[PDB]
Amino acid sequence: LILKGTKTVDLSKDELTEIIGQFDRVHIDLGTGDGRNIYKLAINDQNTFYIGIDPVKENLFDISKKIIKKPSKGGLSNVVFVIAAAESLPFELKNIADSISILFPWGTLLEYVIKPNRDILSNVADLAKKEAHFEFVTTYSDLSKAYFLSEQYKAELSNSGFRIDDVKELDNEYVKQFNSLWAKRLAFGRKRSFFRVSGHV
Numbered sequence: 001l002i003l004k005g006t007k008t009v010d011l012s013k014d015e016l017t018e019i020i021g022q023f024d025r026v027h028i029d030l031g032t033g034d035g036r037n038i039y040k041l042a043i044n045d046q047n048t049f050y051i052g053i054d055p056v057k058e059n060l061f062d063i064s065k066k067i068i069k070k071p072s073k074g075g076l077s078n079v080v081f082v083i084a085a086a087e088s089l090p091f092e093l094k095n096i097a098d099s100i101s102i103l104f105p106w107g108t109l110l111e112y113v114i115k116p117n118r119d120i121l122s123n124v125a126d127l128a129k130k131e132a133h134f135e136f137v138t139t140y141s142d143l144s145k146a147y148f149l150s151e152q153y154k155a156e157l158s159n160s161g162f163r164i165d166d167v168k169e170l171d172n173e174y175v176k177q178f179n180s181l182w183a184k185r186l187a188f189g190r191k192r193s194f195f196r197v198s199g200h201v
């Protein structure tokens, strides 16, 4: 299931493969939100096909309507919005991404990353190609770098297919570069700690 403007339509595996054809890389943003972050990534790199996934189609309507417009009007040819959840990812996305990101998650997705939920993370790892980079950027209260650096957390992620190569604590200034309304709120509000766990799959 993908969005064509405000309408939900079916995209087959063969159709997806055809679209991917004009691009050298594929990036998946899980729990993409309002689509503004992915829109910015896509506008700055036309050799990567961007796939934004979120179970809430309603919040993607504005940007979904924008990408279908003509190029001169803000339209993009390297973005697709998939309506799905981490617990039930589309089989068409298996082994397709060069990179996967989960940015400023909330709700169940945040817990799957922080706990972490090994089975769910395993499903997310299945979306990656043999290669593949990953990036999880989280924040809770306005846990800690130590937690994400612990052997237990590293082992749990490794079991799911994620090999941590770096853990960095980021600040509000860093988040000011993102365009989603949510990211702006997090960046402009009280001082908050953000953590990026990144590596390869």
Ligand SMILES: Nc1ncnc2c1ncn2[C@@H]1O[C@H](CSCC[C@H](N)C(=O)O)[C@@H](O)[C@H]1O
Pocket: 030, 031, 032, 033, 034, 037, 053, 054, 055, 056, 084, 085, 086, 087, 102, 103, 104, 105, 106, 107, 108, 109, 110, 180, 181, 182, 183
């Ligand atoms: N289990 C799950 N699977 C997929 N997406 C989920 C999810 N649980 C929560 N989400 C999505 O995670 C988002 C958290 S808020 C917005 C995050 C976005 N990445 C940004 O920076 O703007 C919401 O849009 C919500 O629908």
